[PDB]
Structure 1
Amino acid sequence: HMATADRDILARLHKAVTSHYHAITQEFENFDTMKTNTISREEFRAICNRRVQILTDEQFDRLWNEMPVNAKGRLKYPDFLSRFS
């Protein structure tokens, strides 16, 4: 969506999700302590830090603009997993 979207970061995020699907899905599960199928923005960034790269605030803000986010500003991870896998 965003004009300054980084297709390289998006492409590598796709690769990361497919290559580490089992582990990443469980990271989501574990952060989702209430099991509402969502995790926090900062928790998602933590996953990005280790699975893709340590994004700058700007890069993360733009990446987040492309994510499936709910009314509370949380990541709808089942939707994320489907798209990036």
Structure 2
Amino acid sequence: RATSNVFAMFDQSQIQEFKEAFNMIDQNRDGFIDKEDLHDMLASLGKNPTDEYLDAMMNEAPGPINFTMFLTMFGEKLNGTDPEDVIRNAFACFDEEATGTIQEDYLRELLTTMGDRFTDEEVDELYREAPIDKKGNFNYIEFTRILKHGAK
């Protein structure tokens, strides 16, 4: 957790985007998020679905979610992640030729032979909801966007 200033965690652009999102996701803007607003947003986004299981997460945070608590719960889960430019720069280390694609077996071997050894199940879980070419080729240049859930 590491309690500290919630504003110093996210970057200027990141905190600005978070504030702009909090100011938008609110049918009755007043610095107080309730289950009704979330249900209405889900109904408007998914073509009127109803998922009553999401209400079982309010107990995690002290009472309703506030903008401060919202930023806190975003930062507590986004810790460790970095922007897309640095991710692409780090990915450019391998391959060398810079083909934009890496073999899936090679990635699995790399993720289980150095640093934090990732189990085979954890590596396989990263492909149960995304496309992939029959000839392998892990399109990293294209997967960087899907990593941020910028689709669907």
Match among 65, 79, 83 for residue 142 of structure 2:
79
Match among 79, 99, 103 for residue 36 of structure 1:
99
> Amino acid of the residue matched to residue 72 of structure 1?
K
Q: How many residues align?
A: 69
Q: Distance in 2 between matches of 1:19 and 1:42?
A: 25
Q: Distance in 1 between matches of 2:88 and 2:117?
A: 20
Alpha-carbon contact 2:111-2:118 (below 8 Å) kept: no
Give the % identical residues. 29
Deviation at 1:75, TM superposition (A): 0.9
Shift in CA distance, 84/41, structure 1 to aligned 2, threshold 3 Å: same
Consecutive unaligned residues in structure 2, runs of 5 or more: 1-77
- Structure with larger RCO (C-alpha < 8 A, sep 6+): 1
The root-mean-square deviation of aligned C-alpha atoms, in Å, is 3.3
- Mapping of residues 1-85 of structure 1, within 5 Å: 15=78, 18-19=81-82, 21-45=84-108, 46=110, 54-85=117-148
Q: TM-score, normalised by structure 1?
A: 0.51
* Deviating 4+ runs (over 4 angstroms): 15-18, 47-50
Shift in CA distance, 20/75, structure 1 to aligned 2, threshold 3 Å: same
> Amino acid of the residue matched to residue 120 of structure 2?
D
Q: TM-score, normalised by structure 2?
A: 0.34
Consecutive unaligned residues in structure 1, runs of 5 or more: 1-14
Q: Distance in 1 between matches of 2:103 and 2:79?
A: 19
CA deviation vs aligned residue, 1:11-60 (integer Å, no higher than 9, x gap): xxxx478515344312322223232211222443436975xx53211221
Structure index of larger Rg: 2
Alpha-carbon contact 1:18-1:84 (below 8 Å) kept: no
